[model samples]
Target: GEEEKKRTARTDYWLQPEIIVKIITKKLGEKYHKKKAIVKEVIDKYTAVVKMIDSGDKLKLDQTHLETVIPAPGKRILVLNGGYRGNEGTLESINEKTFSATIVIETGPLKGRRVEGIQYEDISKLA
Candidate 1:
């Protein structure tokens, strides 16, 4: 048998890996026309080991090679700069016309709180 996992004293993460991203720019003549990827490790401040899910290819991609992914509902997301910044939550829904997201906070004193008016740029998927 071979099995092991670590959920230890803290950090509770893989250096904050596993953020989904969209390939905004392209290489090989727009080969990645609509390609998106899952970040495995952000070894550098602006670079990381990335993986394409469908075909399952991996690469050393710069942060510039990809853009933040707009996640579907019922997913966990990271918050960006704002009063509620740096927080994360489970997205419940979004306002199509208003471009806002509704999510339930995952941590802090605000746990169980639902922030109903977060902007698209204000949150991102965590795989």
Candidate 2:
């Protein structure tokens, strides 16, 4: 058995549903610009159906229009890729030079393990 995948384009963002994201967009700027949204469903890998916290209306947006949020140290975060994808963690520290961060997994099978150098994109703040 074999399963091969590709993550070459922005469409390869690996965005998952239920995770919170900061909307970074221009087309829908006025209504949801720089605002937070919760991904309700994943469509075509790159576009997700999300609804803002302020409003209950669901909207589908390209992954490029979303951004992950990193919380302060000792706070919770969501993992977005690799073996720990979709796992929850605590922000341990950061090395801004590379935008990589140290996180401690709090949810999932790999709990209590110190996860190193999780790039900014792969970790997100709580919704």
Candidate 3:
């Protein structure tokens, strides 16, 4: 088949946390010219994220971009921050609608991490 040069599509990527760490470390190493420190720095930074959240810092994960159990809603469904496994916390209505989706940790060493537990983390700073 011939390629369709007349059209373009935007695609998304889903990568594991470890892979993200690896890529970040490689980039950091290249930036600093310190190949040996890559693993140490990456691991330390990753673990530091855990420790900061554990210390009561707020954390949230938005599942909007991830593959979900439900077919995409033809109309907007209110998304809340709490839902059963593999589903976004969503509520759809035509009147007085409010939606919130709690961020759930999907993978990494922090799988199942919740948003409420880290309420004190001041995530707005990072954002």
Candidate 4:
């Protein structure tokens, strides 16, 4: 049973398309700035395809230290752009491994509809 858990832990993180990640540290030069990226593929247990949203560039890197992006709970935030742009929401729940959040919109057409998988860069905390 120990081996089973080890195997499960190895494949525990379901890195796939649309999953968001933050670059904590990498050796890649100037190409990655610890910014948020979207997962494009899971090359293996340790490698992945991630497209940097800011630069619109894709790269395959070791999944080590890459953290799933998410917002703090109970924080009021404003969506910067996109379909939910300009809307405010309170962060309800965040997927620790996926970087997605459950948001209850406080404004706009999406108000009351709980949205998920919102990229961290897409919203900013309301001070």
* Best TM-score among the predictions, by candidate number: 2
- For each candidate in turn, the TM-score is 0.68, 0.78, 0.17, 0.46
List candidate 3 stretches off by more than 4 Å: 1-98, 116-127
Sliding window of 10 residues with minimal summed lDDT for model 2: 1-10
lDDT of 3 by residue, 1-127 (tens): 0234332111222211211111223222243221111111122222312112212322222212111111121221212112222222221211112122223443445454443321111111110
Locate the minimum summed-lDDT window of 10 residues in model 3: 118-127
Per-residue lDDT of candidate 1, residues 5-107 (tens digit):
2221122122235767776667622656367777887875467777876557786677567666668888898765345566778889988765668888887
| lDDT at position 119, candidate 1 | 61
Q: What pairs collide in candidate 2?
A: none
Q: In candidate 4, how many clashes are counted?
A: 0
- Report lDDT (CA) for all predictions: 0.66, 0.76, 0.21, 0.62
| Per-prediction CA RMSD (Å) | 11.5, 5.4, 17.3, 10.5
Per-residue CA lDDT of model 2 for 1-127, tens digit only, reads 0124333122256677767788888577677888888888888768898789787768889888888777789888878876677788888998697576888889867899787777778777765
Give the per-residue lDDT of model 4 (tens digit) for 32-125: 7578777777787367788887888887766674555555798776554345665777888776565446677888677886776665545544
Q: If the candidates were sorted by their lDDT against the true structure, best first, what order would they fall in?
A: 2, 1, 4, 3
lDDT of 1: 0.66
Please tell me which model should have the higher lDDT, number 1 or number 4. 1
After best superposition, candidate 3 residue 84: deviation in angstroms?
Answer: 19
> What C-alpha root-mean-square deviation, in Å, does candidate 3 show against the real structure?
17.3
Pairs of residues clashing in candidate 1: none
